[PDB]
């Protein structure tokens, strides 16, 4: 079901096996470097059930550049690309104890053998204006849609402004549960007949 869908939840505790398989996963984790996750919590996330063949996009900063690579490999991905977002103001000028930081990093991992994706349409540098704090650039959704148009996607640690068509967004600041895909709805009521997500 194409329109935006989302689940307010604690990603540590949701049973993600009910969501099915996805062509693309994106995560912008609250790395322990607010409502963050310990390194072990990140390692333990049940990312492997989310995909059979496809790509994962993992935002990283500071020492999560290394920890994110560890998680990526633990969950079964090879890192095959690394997008950087050059942060600009509205006039296209560029906005870490040794250098000032002009960019953010997004690791790109692959799992299995994805078929029918449009690899090489976009390049690996985003130039885009900073919006609010911790707000990733919307250009990433367009890059992912051109790479894999029409397919099902899932975002971890999203916020309300992140909900997108063809995406299911998970985060604990989303407004309730909004599911439209009948397969997901069916598995969700079976797994959560009272609409509560606990252990």
């Amino acid at each position: 079901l194409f329109p935006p869908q989302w689940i307010c939840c604690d990603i540590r505790y949701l049973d993600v096996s009910i969501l099915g398989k996805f062509a693309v996963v994106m995560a912008d984790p609250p790395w322990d470097i607010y409502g963050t996750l310990t390194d072990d919590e990140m390692r333990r996330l049940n990312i492997p059930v989310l995909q059979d063949d496809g790509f994962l996009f993992l935002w990283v900063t500071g020492r999560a550049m290394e920890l994110g690579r560890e998680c990526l490999n633990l969950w079964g991905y090879e890192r095959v690309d690394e997008i950087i977002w050059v942060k600009t103001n509205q006039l296209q000028r560029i906005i870490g104890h040794w250098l000032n930081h002009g960019k953010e990093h997004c690791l790109v991992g692959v799992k299995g053998n994805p078929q029918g994706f449009n690899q090489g349409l976009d390049c690996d540098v985003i130039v885009a204006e900073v919006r609010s704090t911790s707000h990733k650039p919307d250009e990433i959704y367009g890059m992912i849609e051109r790479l894999s148009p029409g397919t099902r996607k899932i975002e971890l640690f999203g916020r309300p402004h992140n909900v997108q068509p063809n995406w299911i967004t998970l985060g604990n600041q989303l407004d309730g549960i909004h599911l439209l895909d009948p397969d997901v709805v069916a598995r969700f009521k079976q797994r959560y007949p009272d609409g509560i997500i606990s252990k």
Binding site: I84, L99, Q119, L121, C123, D124, A128, M143
Partner: protein
């Protein structure tokens, strides 16, 4: 404006549209120039060369092994070779490393290297290549690539116990078969004021620079002498950053 869509539409990379790509404090550049040692350099086949011959121990090491991926349409070093370099044997206990890693598997294996030699990565410096002069030149992709690769990374590592510069270098993509890295990496390194024993491994005649010892297989001449070189840093000059006045 979505510059990603625009790249799909026109082939102009998004970095083509970064601009400038009220204070000055370049008494430091002049101080670096005054403190710099004479350029020193040695032709040496690094695979066959006992790295321990290079003394004393270095404060900064810039490592630029010639990766195969640099020769798209063109002796390369693999990460197997690079990882087996004894770099910890020549690095000072407090010292820095700058490792050009390319844009592929080197972003991972270069991190393995840093840890193997005892460094922690403290910065990730991206050389972003514009194509203002050649919007219509598609990239022949790595088989594993998801995206067109338009940048290279130089990883900075520290071992032992911001300022003016940004972790980005923006230049036009060099002509085919030109393997040179932007000289701006030297300015960033020298602006840190890290000490005066500076080694560039896999440098070339074209990269020799005051303040640096350059060691590489393609150098045409050498002037390296270990005792002469050590004498640049003997007392009272042992601890200088390279950013302070010479001692009377």
């Amino acid at each position: 404006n979505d510059y990603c869509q625009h790249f799909v539409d026109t082939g102009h990379r998004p970095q083509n549209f970064i601009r400038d790509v009220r204070e000055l404090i370049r008494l430091k550049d002049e101080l670096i120039a005054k403190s710099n040692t004479p350029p020193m350099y040695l032709q040496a086949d690094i695979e066959a060369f006992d790295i321990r011959e290079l003394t004393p121990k270095f404060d900064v090491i810039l490592l630029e092994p010639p990766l195969e991926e640099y020769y798209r349409e063109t002796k390369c070093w693999t990460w197997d070779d690079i990882m087996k370099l004894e770099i910890d044997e020549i690095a000072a206990p407090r010292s820095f490393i700058f490792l050009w890693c390319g844009s592929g598997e080197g972003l991972d294996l270069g991190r393995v290297c840093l840890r193997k030699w005892g460094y922690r990565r403290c910065e990730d410096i991206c050389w972003i290549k514009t194509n203002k002069n050649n919007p219509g030149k598609t990239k022949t992709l790595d088989p594993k690539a998801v995206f067109q690769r338009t940048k290279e990374h130089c990883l900075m590592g520290i071992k032992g116990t911001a300022n003016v510069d940004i972790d980005l270098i923006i230049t036009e993509e060099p002509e085919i078969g030109n393997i040179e890295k932007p000289v701006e990496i030297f300015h960033i390194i020298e602006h840190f004021c890290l000490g005066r024993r500076r080694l560039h491994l896999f440098g070339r005649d074209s990269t020799i620079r005051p303040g640096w010892l350059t060691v590489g297989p393609t150098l045409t001449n050498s002037n390296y002498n270990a005792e002469t070189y050590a004498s640049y840093f003997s007392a009272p000059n042992s601890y200088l950053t390279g950013c302070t006045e010479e001692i009377e």
